Amino acid sequence: EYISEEVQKAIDDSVKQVFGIKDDSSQVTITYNKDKVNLWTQQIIDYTIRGLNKLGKHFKYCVTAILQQTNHAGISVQITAYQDTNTDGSLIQCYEINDIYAIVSVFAMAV
């Protein structure tokens, strides 16, 4: 009784509301910062979980986030688990603005 499409919609609401700005200039006046990246990761995760517990669904979630500095290095993000067919599942998302390569990985399970 859910849809991972909407799970992704909620993740997108969270991220693009926290840092995403429609007018694309403040997003590079906000470039990757060694001092502020801790605040970024923690607050992204906290706001995302606040969005998730806004949902009254009885399913159980767990979240992971990755923040990459630059495209030169390259990365591979892969997912795998072991759960129940009907209700459980997962979700991934890649995200890019100018110089921040964000990735979110969520697991949703029954009970």
Place this chain on the structure above:
Amino acid sequence: NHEPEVKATDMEEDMIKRVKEIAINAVKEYKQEKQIAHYIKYEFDKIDGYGWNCIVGRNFGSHIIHQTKKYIFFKINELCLLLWKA
């Protein structure tokens, strides 16, 4: 394997030797055409400022310009490497 060889060149001797070394290193390190061209264009952009162009291929036609002493066209083991500036 075999050393480079110029089919048409306009460079000085010491500048020929540098592009020889950079081509050898590029081909030993990278294995892709765009990667080799990007790396050599980068090497000569670091050594000689801005405005380098490098065409790396197997059968192409070109009609280009350059600075008078910044052009070279040489082949390595059936690889046509052209290079020029501006």
Place this chain on the structure above:
Amino acid sequence: IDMPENSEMKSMKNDAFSQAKFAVENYKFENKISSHIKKFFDEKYGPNWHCVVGKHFNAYVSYDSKNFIFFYEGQLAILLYRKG
């Protein structure tokens, strides 16, 4: 009975025979024979070659002029040509 040609000087034609005669005896499966011939010619002359071994088969390929060798080696038949 059939010997398609290649470049003069016997630079590659003399090579292909001497290589394939060792290849055929050294192995039983065609895999090692054909891979040996192709892998050698890649190091020797060209970037990409193509080799076929077998008793009976017909083929029709595109290739580069004077780079198509085909010979009935013993009971077997070996085809080779550059392409790419």
Place this chain on the structure above:
Amino acid sequence: LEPKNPQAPKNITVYDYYTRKFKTDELVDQMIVHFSMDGDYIWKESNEYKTQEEIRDTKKALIKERNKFNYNTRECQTINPSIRERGVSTEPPPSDTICGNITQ
């Protein structure tokens, strides 16, 4: 499960023109990607504003004193072999089948 990516090759080869061999590579990247888009909008970066505004500045001051003397055309073309389609045939070798009796 440790996911394998469908719609992917399993190993990558490429010719080395320094070491005249090939060399294959059996590790393949397995991230499904569609529509990567490159951008050209650059906001108060340290590295790009300098490198653009400086070159435009120097060009315009130079022309304020066509200016680089007229260039010279060139030409070069490579050798392009022709593509031919030729197909040949082998044949199953013949065999014989006799019958003989045993003598005294």
Place this chain on the structure above:
Amino acid sequence: PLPPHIIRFNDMAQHLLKKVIRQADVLIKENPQGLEKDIALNLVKFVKSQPEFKIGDGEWQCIIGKNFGCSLTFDANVLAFFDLLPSRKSILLFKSG
């Protein structure tokens, strides 16, 4: 509907490439034999003529080939490289930067 093709790399707005595809196709059909010189000449003389393609840093260049690789200081705006499936001619179009 466009004629089938494989855009290996394009940078200009899509209607520019539409025009390029249609004229390059009809031109490869009108000149099915000869050298790629004539193809290049006719394509440049047509492409340079239209009131469109207004902006240019340098000027027009077209290259036809079947096996190569290159790297150019193309004008950051216009660049096209694609293939015509029936004849498989890797055709390239840009403006000098």
Place this chain on the structure above:
Amino acid sequence: LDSLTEQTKMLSTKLSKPVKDIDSLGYVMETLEQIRKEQAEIDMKFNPVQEMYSLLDNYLPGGITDKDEMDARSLLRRNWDILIQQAEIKGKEYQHK
């Protein structure tokens, strides 16, 4: 051999013929260099002669009729070597003066 040689030697005699093109050059030097780029294509259309005379002088060195062969072929490559040398030297000294 004769035709290709008359071409290359004509390029050389254009480099050397008029006191004008000797001292005050013009756009004609751009055409000389154009023919020098073409010189690739010129040797491409000449290469049938290299292998053919190779097959000929394999078992027929000549010595009697090889006079004009020596003249023409060596005249081609003479234009080539003076091309490299005079291109370099003339470029440098015309830059000096």
Place this chain on the structure above:
Amino acid sequence: QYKTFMGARVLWPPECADDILEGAIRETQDALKKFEIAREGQKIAEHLKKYMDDHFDPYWHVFFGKNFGCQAVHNKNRFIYFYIEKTAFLMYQTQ
């Protein structure tokens, strides 16, 4: 267990895709019936690979006979393997 198909015994489920399948599963016997005979050799696979390269992706490889069997790695999901009247057909596309 080599399940039946309106064309032939196909290893169900296989590792290819049905425009290719239906095309091959109709084209193999269409080719063999129209003007072709089992007496001729690979002038069959000639027209088969030609037809495949004409419509579908260009780089194909065909192997058919009465005794063969292969492992390999190819383009994902481009593996046709079917028997027909005790004659194994195998086809795969490589980029």
Place this chain on the structure above:
Amino acid sequence: YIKNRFYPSKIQKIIKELFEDRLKGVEYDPNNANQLSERLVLELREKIKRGKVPRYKIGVQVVFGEIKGQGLRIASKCLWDVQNDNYASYTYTSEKVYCTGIVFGCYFE
């Protein structure tokens, strides 16, 4: 006990053939996109009906849209005993539209 089994690529077959011959390079018209999906989903379901899987339950799913300066990510997870149950998935994208279909299969027991 599973004598007749499900492997991915015959449904992957059906789904490819279906996609080319039905989409035939159609544009993304907004007034009929959802109903185009409605039609071809049921056609695909009919095809898996002859898809020769007795106890394998079929969770059909399809995506259809147009590509316009638009980055996208679609992924699923598999949730079954690998010995019996399996999945299938195909993508098909032209110059301006993209249609991708997935089909589950779960051996009933």
